[PDB]
Amino acid sequence: QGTQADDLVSAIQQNANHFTELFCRAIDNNMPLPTKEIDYKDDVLDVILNQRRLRNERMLSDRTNEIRSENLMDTPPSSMNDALREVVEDE
Amino acid sequence: AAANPLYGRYNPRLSPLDNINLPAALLSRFDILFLMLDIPSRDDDEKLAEHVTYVHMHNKQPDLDFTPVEPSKMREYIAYAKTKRPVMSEAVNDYVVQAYIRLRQDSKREMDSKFSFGQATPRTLLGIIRLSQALAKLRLADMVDIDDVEEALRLVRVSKESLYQE
Amino acid sequence: SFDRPEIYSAPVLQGESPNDDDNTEIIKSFKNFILEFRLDSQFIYRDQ
Amino acid sequence: PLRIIWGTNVSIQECTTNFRNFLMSFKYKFRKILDEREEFINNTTDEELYYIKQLNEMRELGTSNLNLDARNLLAYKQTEDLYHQLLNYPQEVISIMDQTIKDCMVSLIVDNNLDYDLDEIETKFYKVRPYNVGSCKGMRELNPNDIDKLINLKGLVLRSTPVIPDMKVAFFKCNVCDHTMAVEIDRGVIQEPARCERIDCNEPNSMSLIHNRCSFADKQVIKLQETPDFVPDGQTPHSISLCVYDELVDSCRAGDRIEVTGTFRSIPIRANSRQRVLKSLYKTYVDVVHVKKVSDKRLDVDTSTIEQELMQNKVDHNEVEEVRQITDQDLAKIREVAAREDLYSLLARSIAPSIYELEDVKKGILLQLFGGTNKTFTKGGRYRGDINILLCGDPSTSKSQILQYVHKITPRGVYTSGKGSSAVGLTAYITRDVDTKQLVLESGALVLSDGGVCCIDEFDKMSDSTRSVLHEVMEQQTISIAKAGIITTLNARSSILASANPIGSRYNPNLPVTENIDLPPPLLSRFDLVYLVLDKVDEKNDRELAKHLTNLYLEDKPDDVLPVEFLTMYISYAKEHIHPIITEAAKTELVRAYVGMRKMGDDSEKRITATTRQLESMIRLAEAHAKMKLKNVVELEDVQEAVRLIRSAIKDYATDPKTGKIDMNLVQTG
Ligand SMILES: Nc1ncnc2c1ncn2[C@@H]1O[C@H](COP(=O)(O)OP(=O)(O)OP(O)(O)=S)[C@@H](O)[C@H]1O
Ligand SMILES: [Mg+2]
Ligand SMILES: [Zn+2]
Known part of the structure; x- marks a missing residue:
């Protein structure tokens, strides 16, 4: 196509150990949602992972609600949401 | 298993059981035992020498009339053959039973003679059944045919009687 | 030639009931004092 | 919600x-x-x-x-x-x-x-x-995602550690004021008190642990040799470690085939004793929930071998069942089968349906399964009704298959091969434990076979030094070890079922019986039955044998024969509740038969001479025959059937009493 692309294959062949978690981070960045719901015929590690993801979502929602209910400045909605998300994800 | 006779060379003076220094039980456990005799002749040694010299010169088999099958191809075909589990119908069972009966009577008759390769055994019956099932597996059929048992009995006969009688 | 292993934590259970003399509860009460104190009508400490 | x-x-x-x-x-x-x-x-x-x-x-x-x-x-x-x-x-x-x-x-x-x-x-x-x-998926096919799951396993118990006290409640005492506290264990950790709990006494480090006042619980470790249903390519069998707790302690003995259901556990193991550093690779074990010691496919354990063990089971309230519970309907079915006229041929025919004919061999196998009566002298002697059978014969006579069936049908036997076994490996040995790194006792094949049948294939290939162990087993049902750490008498009440070939790997009519068998006289006389199983070439026998082995291949999953479950429960009931006794009419028959055989042995080694052990074998066989028909007394026809089985096993009708040779076409009927 003419665009410039780095030699990812040689970089993998030289330093594959770092590229393992690089691929893992990229895969977790765009992970599709499961079509089938979880059930009783499902693995124990899988239900643990589902509970961990739901628990993380509950932490994020609860901290967002507490910080928004504090109402520090009482005042740009999108920038406010971005800053609140960043402070929630860092705290 | 690969083995030599008692003196290292087959001699027709003694019985086949004598120079196959091998107990009757462990002999009966082998389904097929081949006597591989090195009988000299003017014609066969010519063709053997031509074959061996061609292999040594060209690093390949002599005959160009057939393409030999690659080991991976043989392996996958043998796996797919091993997936099969052939069975036997009443007629082929009856033929196997008759062949077993005649084999045991022949082994009774040749026991006193010097041409004995042993005494016929139910393990020989089971070996015939297993060779027939393997031959049916090569044909990729769920049934064992009459020709499979024909080939099995022919193989048992040519293993011992054919080369020794010549 | 491996790295230093890292240790992290995640809140799951309620745990033991909080006590007033605990440092975390004193910090939380002080934080609520800063955020929620009103002199007349304004959060003077929050604005300060 | x-x-x-x-x-x-x-x-x-x-x-x-x-x-x-x-x-x-x-x-x-x-x-x-x-x-x-x-x-x-x-x-x-x-x-x-x-x-x-x-x-x-x-x-x-x-x-x-x-x-x-x-x-x-x-x-x-x-x-x-x-x-x-x-x-x-x-x-x-x-x-x-x-x-x-x-x-x-x-x-x-x-x-x-x-x-x-x-x-x-x-x-x-x-x-x-x-x-x-x-x-029952295997141990080695399990994965770390299966940790703390319920798993079911087959196995054979090899050994068990002694009763280990694991500490549940801890008892701490003050040194100065003698104030004590009890603390419960919490997930394997006990909190020792830094300060005295008393208001008056609050001295630091004054609490000391008194090890005998604190309460303990039972914990036992059993080494189990697993027998998976499916074995992968070239998988070599291993031993697991299973931990039993409380009531289940000492419920499994060395050498029994058991069904363990338990929890798949993993713990880290300390690398050194002085350091608290643990290993990253975990050690797996089974935390046992339930043990099933009874299979409907095989016979129940002999009750005469575990009497005090059943009493200790009652005392400990472990209440793991050792024998099948017989209802009323199946008990009535057992009696109505026992009243059938052809019960002997019916039970012998139902032993090995895939094995054709060998009717007298199957009858002897049946009588060995039933066993003779066990008599305990009040003075201190003991007589065990264990029948030993030797099967000497031509190759391919379905005798190895008879050993395989008996090994599968017995409760706690061990299958061994000739010269693949040693004298130390049959009795007892010292091993190194992987866990404790200690010298431990482990039972050999004959001790592991106590209460069952030891099957020995290729008995002629066994060396004489290894063969010398079996003498004490067949005469006193014991092994008296005097070794470096062991000086004791171990009960091995095991029935020996051996298979053998002649010297020339085929029976030779020109040679006599004793030369063909090739076992020494003090060894062969201990066998209650010696079966000369010969391959005679016939028309009709070969035809029917070919048909029998050829109908097995008609379908993928292949008269009247009893199911294996009913046969096992019938033999178990007869062994448990029937103890026949000798009457005077049986005594006269036994004595007359013994004197008749001794008189027949007067003629001139080449022939098998009569033996006092042959009288005892007649007694045991008659007792087993009477136990079969649920009679509490041994009648005269039991003695006649014992004599008939002994004479037909060695083919005394075919042999010539003078020369000792056996003819084929003359007397033998295939
Ligand atoms: N009378 C028979 N009834 C049923 N199966 C038989 C009979 N005779 C031979 N066979 C079968 O033929 C095969 C021969 O193996 P085995 O008889 O077990 O060997 P063996 O009799 O112990 O003699 P060895 O091994 O030389 S000591 C097995 O598959 C047997 O099941
Ligand atoms: Mg055998
Ligand atoms: Zn104190």
């Missing part, structure tokens, strides 16, 4: 209600429908509430244990989820089951207004033992 235990999908309320409904409303006809068995449903047993009556008889007997079949949870519709929750999370679901079993025990007398007091029931701690949790 509804609460779920973290890490699981289990609700205490939902599981409690589901299991309570299951216990109140289960019928064994559900298990019949689930196993696709509609024609076997009967009104009087299947339609009765199974766990209701089981909990009732649990209340009457003082039993505190419920044996729960996990397949029954799949039989019920509402507990099909709970079944999976039992397999994935045994640790809390079992506790839920115990709590609701206690609730059900309260409810059965609260609702129905029984006279039992509630205090005794609510003081008791009821616990459940799930079993039959699924397919």
